Design a protein around this ligand. Sequence first.
Ligand SMILES: *[C@@H]1O[C@H](CO)[C@@H](O[C@@H]2O[C@H](CO)[C@@H](O)[C@H](O)[C@H]2NC(C)=O)[C@H](O)[C@H]1NC(C)=O
Ligand code: CUO
Ligand code: CUO
Lengths: 366, 736, 118
Amino acid sequence: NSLTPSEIENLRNALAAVQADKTDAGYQKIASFHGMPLSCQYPDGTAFACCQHGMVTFPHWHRLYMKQMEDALKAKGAKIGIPYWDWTTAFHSLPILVTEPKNNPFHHGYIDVADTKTTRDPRPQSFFYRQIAFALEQRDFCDFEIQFEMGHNAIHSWVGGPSPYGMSTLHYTSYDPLFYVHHSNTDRIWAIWQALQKYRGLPYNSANCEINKLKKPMMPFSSEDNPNEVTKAHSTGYKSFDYQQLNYEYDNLNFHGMTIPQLEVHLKKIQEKDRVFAGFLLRAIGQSADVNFDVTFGGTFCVLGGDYEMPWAFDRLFLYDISKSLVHLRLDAHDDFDIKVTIMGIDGKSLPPNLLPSPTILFKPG
Amino acid sequence: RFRKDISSLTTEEEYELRVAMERFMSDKSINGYQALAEFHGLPAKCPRPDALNRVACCIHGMATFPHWHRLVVMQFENALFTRGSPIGVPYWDWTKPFTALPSLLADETYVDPYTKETKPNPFFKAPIEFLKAGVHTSRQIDERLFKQPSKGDHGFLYDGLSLAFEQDDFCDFEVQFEVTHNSIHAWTGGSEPYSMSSLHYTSFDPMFWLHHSQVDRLWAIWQALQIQRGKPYKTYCANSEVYRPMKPFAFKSPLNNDEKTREHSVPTDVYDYQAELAYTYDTLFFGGLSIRELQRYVEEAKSKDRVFAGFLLMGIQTSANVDLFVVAGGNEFFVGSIAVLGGSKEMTWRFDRVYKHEITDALGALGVDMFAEYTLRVDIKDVNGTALPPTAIPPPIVIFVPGIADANVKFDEQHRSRKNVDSMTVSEMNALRTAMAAFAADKEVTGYQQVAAFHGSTQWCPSPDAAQKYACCHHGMATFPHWHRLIALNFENGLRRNGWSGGLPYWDWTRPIDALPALVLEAEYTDANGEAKPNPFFSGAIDSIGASTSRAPTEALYEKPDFGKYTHLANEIISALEQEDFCDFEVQYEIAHNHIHALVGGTEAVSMASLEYSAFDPIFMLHHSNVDRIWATWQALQKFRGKAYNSANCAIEILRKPMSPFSLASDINPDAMTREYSVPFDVFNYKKNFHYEYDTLELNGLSIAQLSREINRRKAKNRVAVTFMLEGLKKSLLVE
Amino acid sequence: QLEALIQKQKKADRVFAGFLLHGIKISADVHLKICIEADCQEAGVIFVLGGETEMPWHFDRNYKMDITDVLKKRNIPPEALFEHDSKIRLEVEIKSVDGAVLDPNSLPKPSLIYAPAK
Ligand SMILES: *[C@@H]1O[C@H](CO)[C@@H](O[C@@H]2O[C@H](CO)[C@@H](O)[C@H](O)[C@H]2NC(C)=O)[C@H](O)[C@H]1NC(C)=O
Ligand code: CUO
Ligand code: CUO
């Protein structure tokens, strides 16, 4: 939004440009890394998917990944950065660039590995607003990520739906032009947070949990075979925190209609009312699935995953406010309740049962 | 919530807060008036109502004096809002030269417009309930003396606060701030034990809050000075003293009942008054000066070698006036009088710094130098004096301050402020009149007739050849706002070129009018020496081509409104402000502006009833300054409404094409900016490009924020509208 | 499907030429030319109906015709419409029924309307 032609105009051609470099990747190599074709090896050299979600270093990999992608439009009239669409802001329909049927580079991608262009199947106050805002509420980075990753993949769930070739799947998502653009946004959200912290004097270009893991280098960005010097340089965890040396800028880190200072007031304002949350333990599973809540509807949230993905388990719980549910039943967090859930696979079936254990249910004043 | 000048209030606003005050005051509870009037002084509720030793609660002689009273004023505000007043607690400038108290708090009674009954004015008096005698507040005695003698170069109150705004450090500012404010307390209070002479009962008199709404605004002014000055505005000189919980406010639910003030009983976050306390002021203009203009005056002030008489003021129980004398030989000289405010049960207080009093002009008029042998005499008289011994207060000392600043030059060499011609000082009036004569004196290109001539038949459209002629003034009327933006700028710049430091003023015709501003109506005016008529603001102006004076005969109206609705012009402009895109606004915008052109334009065709002869009457400058102001109000509204403000997407054809007469450089007009910014697209952003800001963007008492609500409230109505398709005819026509 | 294509179009940035029309007591055809460098292109055309015996009419607003695609052909980006530096102007050759004749311009000049997408 707010684009002025031909600002829109330059880009398609650039996206068009890299559709085949196709040597460096040119774009398929650039696609593989999140995508299906096998990124790396266990020392036994077994196939892994070099996807770096599910961990705490989740943003860096991507935020980069935009870079790799972002660089890729290099001097191809890559006159401005990949745009972002703020899925937080409620929207009746999808965004043009990726809709226009004819002569548009954002409609789809192709996949040499499958012989096909991507297929997408969209599925039906703003929900994401509420969900993201919580993430912002948090002050620990780790605490933030779990919500930040889960708020994120909610869209890879809904944009793609039931096609293997799609955004719902790990395997071929990276292939669809829609994916980066969703990202800029995800990345933007992260940036906003950093500004938030900074406002609060908490660490923003650093992070105290866990010291373990930010230090592990990241492939493919690690790999020798990445012919972009920059990413390797920040291939690490701890670099890549200060996105400033990227170097890019977002037009404005303001959540919709809010100064950052304004934003904290907001969150602070929200925080008055005592809330009640549910938190799940989520852990790796090969398939990708959506999960639907109940007590009235309490749902819902989604998990992103695919075959041959590195397994992962979150350190912390994932929280989802269910207070509206209680009022719905008129309960006081006092009267006691059964929190009933459901968990569908992205493919048509089949809501298999946990898997995830039991949800805890906790109360925050106030 | 908007805090306005007492004079700026409409009768609606005046009556609505009178009822609110009436209700708040009339009926007594712990949430009532008296309970609040008792916060400041003498039921003696501090440190606790329990037990043995109790003193007045309010903080004085300390850096937290303004913090404390900011809360009390806020308490009063919320209390009135809750009882049906749309406006925050209004203020009155005492800095303005005034002979007597404003009618709002002066009148004993007032008439109810609806009931047509005359009932007691709530702001004249106030009962004192904790005593059983009653009533008994009585501001009736005013001390010596209102206009003179006190100081002044000039205005007692104005000088002292000027000096206050001058200081860099908070405490340095605070002393001068408080003790100057102290005077109007003792001044209005007089010999009367009650009503503001005594710290005890001062807050019972309703003037107190109108008083301290001003005091609060003054702090806000100083605060804005500091950010421009680029220096810290918080109270660091007394850092510990900010963390002490404000005495009567911090108390628990029975003793104090206001949430907002209790959270802020620790003044640390009280500084950002707009965010935390949710109010603001109509203007932060001090005197006639804007905030940037304000720093200029203190620079001219700070460039002189100054000598002061410094007083260390500590608490003596009574409230007292000390009269200062400079005695350099034989008899002495009266250099001024300062007041210290107190009571028998006052909280014990003492200033860390010294109060500086200027004494600089006492020396000059004494035929005495700074370093000559002289004593200072003080005679301390109690307000119930029974005059006090001079030892009651420690002896004053003289302080010498050498000239200092080189902060020049300054980025406001281009900056201007446009104010009301109805609000102007006689000094400022004469300054405008002389400047305009020189403007009018020039008969060729750099002069006043040329800029007025852009409304003339002189043919610049097209050129060099134009086969057949028409007037080159921009109408049509999409680009009407832009062109007059530049015309009013030319009128301004040429007027600035001729010895003037201000911007082109305006007059509010959205608001009702009795007669034309004093600046215009009269043929002859009196200069400081006394003078024949220049004038040059009477309609008399020679049009070189027509060789006559553009006479302007008034019309039969204009005063229609009753209590209920706004003036017809106010209604029109609201409908104009409603619109989303520029053109739908523009049509209403100007058709509204066409009014006065026809209203001061009488039968006479030489008047501004015709757009050909229109600009030769100088009120045109005032008119389309205000016309331009509305266009600026809109731009702020569009920003508020999250829509395009310094651009537009309709009628690009004319909006991208440079104006006919301004774009013809360089021989035809001297202005650097109207040449560079001649394209309508460039003239949109007036703030950055033309370097001038307006007095206020308030419309008919409604702020921009309130305006949008009023605009929205109307839009909720189911309403019919009649539309008119208008074409240009040579005649100047009234259509009913 | 109709509303589908309509909503589709509002999602594109578009440029229009606004025409205030009225009865000129005779029918006529209005050809629209937008000239960038004084190089002129036939952008679009408007027809007006009327007669010797006519009921005088003035439109309540202006009819629109989009030059959006025409601009794309001249490779002058919608952004350049705002720029004074860039040279674009709008011209109309009004031509009557009997031929030529042609009418001296009795119809108000067209305006550029930029409709940003939603
Ligand atoms: C007016 O002021 C005088 C001067 O202070 C008051 O007299 C003092 O009153 C206090 C008690 O309030 C005594 O402790 C002092 O010793 C008195 N000093 C002098 C010089 O009189 C006097 O009480 C006041 N008058 C009224 C009517 O209040
Ligand atoms: O300050 Cu408490 O009195 Cu005006
Ligand atoms: O200016 Cu052209 O007339 Cu009000």
